[PDB]
Amino acid sequence: KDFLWPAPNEEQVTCLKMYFGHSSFKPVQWKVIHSVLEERRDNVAVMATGYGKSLCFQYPPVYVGKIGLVISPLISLMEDQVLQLKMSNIPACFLGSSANVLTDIKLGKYRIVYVTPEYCSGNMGLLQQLEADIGITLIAVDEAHCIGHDFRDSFRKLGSLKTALPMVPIVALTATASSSIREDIVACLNLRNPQITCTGFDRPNLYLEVRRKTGNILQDLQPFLVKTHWEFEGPTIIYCPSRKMTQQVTGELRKLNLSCGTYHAGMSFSTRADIHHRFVRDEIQCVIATMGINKADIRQVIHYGAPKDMESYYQEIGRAGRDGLQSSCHVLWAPADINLNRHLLTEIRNAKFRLYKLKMMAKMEKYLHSSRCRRQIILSHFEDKQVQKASLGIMGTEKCCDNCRSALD
Ligand SMILES: Nc1ncnc2c1ncn2[C@@H]1O[C@H](COP(=O)(O)OP(=O)(O)OP(O)(O)=S)[C@@H](O)[C@H]1O
Ligand SMILES: [Zn+2]
């Protein structure tokens, strides 16, 4: 149910507004936050993209004014989150093998402390000292940050956190309902009677289509344009596989006077914040991207070129129709696309990582070539086997996907 129990009190709701700008907690967020704060319980939160997984670990230490330890091997992503938190008046730091920051962590100056798994393995005694002196509200581990080609490959070394900090709850975030992966998480992290919550993975308001490329950027994108200078039907994100393609597509759209912005990891935090703000305010109609985009009313997502893998594809299309209204997500691809080029995978000498990447690429290729319901493929991929009635209602209809629509011809 979407009934929050117990109800967030006045101190909790005003804190949420002051530090995060939100007026209410979402149901799965609240289940996790409450369990961490009141029950001090480990949690495995299976959360679909765009739900609000980050609040699960950022809010509790901010509310009690203690430390949330966020463990990830993605150093540049953590450095960027420090800056997002800074803009909300939440002090955060990255702690690594950091003389001026460790002294300040011991003084209570930081709410969120980002560390790599490598750092944790060598400094358990230091983390025990922080828990004894200040208190650690929670430890957060995101399974998705293992994109090192496995949760075990990325976080194997964390099988000592729970033994060093037995009373500190761990919140493990995952973007898949796979029982095998949940078992891998519980076992690797030594979770004690964890609370398991899941959001479900369908987004019924997204029409899914896959179409082959025609041999020219403007020729491929022309069908998405409506007359006025021509423009898209609504706010649109175009995902490209490389910074070069992002600039090529941007250059072509600008020949048609489309209002565009680019969004990639080569840009600074401040330049990305400006594009995001302008897209949110509808001062630009299209963002061409290669670090998410949160906007309520994205009406169209286009992957210009085959996506990398099902997980990133799903996260990317998930930015669409966050308001619940009808949106469309189209993949324009060709077998020669760089994300299906087996050469760089075939170059890997190691047998294990060459097999993992080849398996991911094969799953993506099978989805692109499929004549089956695209929605069912996605739901099955994320092992969301208990399909919701809403999903059964959308599937098979003209608004589900291109294959469902052509079966109705
Ligand atoms: N309680 C809330 N109410 C309204 N918005 C929220 C709430 N919690 C989080 N959000 C927003 O939801 C968006 C998604 O949250 P994130 O924790 O960044 O999840 P994410 O799956 O990494 O998002 P994407 O998919 O990468 S855009 C962010 O803009 C949050 O600010
Ligand atoms: Zn379908």
Residue numbers in the entry: 525 to 621, 624 to 673, 677 to 757, 760 to 821, 826 to 944
What does the primary publication say about this deposited structure?
The Werner syndrome RecQ helicase WRN was identified as a synthetic lethal target in cancer cells with microsatellite instability (MSI) by several genetic screens. WRN is a multifunctional enzyme with both helicase and exonuclease activities and has roles in various cellular processes that are crucial for the maintenance of genome stability, including DNA replication, transcription, DNA repair and telomere maintenance. Dissection of the helicase and exonuclease enzymatic activities of WRN using loss-of-function mutations showed that WRN dependency in vitro and in vivo in MSI cells is linked only to its helicase function. WRN dependence in MSI cells was linked to WRN helicase-mediated resolution of secondary DNA structures resulting from large-scale expansions of dinucleotide TA repeats that otherwise result in chromosome breakage.
While HRO761 and ATP analogues both bind at the D1–D2 interface with overlap in the D2 residues, the relative orientation is rotated by approximately 180° due to a conformational change of residues 728–732 (Thr-Gly-Phe-Asp-Arg), a flexible hinge between the D1 and D2 domains. An overlay of the D2 domains of ATPγS- and HRO761-bound WRN shows that the hydroxy pyrimidine moiety of HRO761 mimics the γ-phosphate of ATP and recapitulates coordination of the hydrolytic water by the catalytic residue Gln850. The domain rotation induced by HRO761 splits the ATP-binding site in two and displaces the Walker motif, resulting in mixed ATP competition through allosteric binding of HRO761. Validated WRN inhibitors (for example, covalent hits, ATPγS) were around sevenfold more potent in this assay compared with in the ATPase assay at ATP KM, whereas false positives (for example, compounds losing potency after repurification) were equipotent in all of the assays.
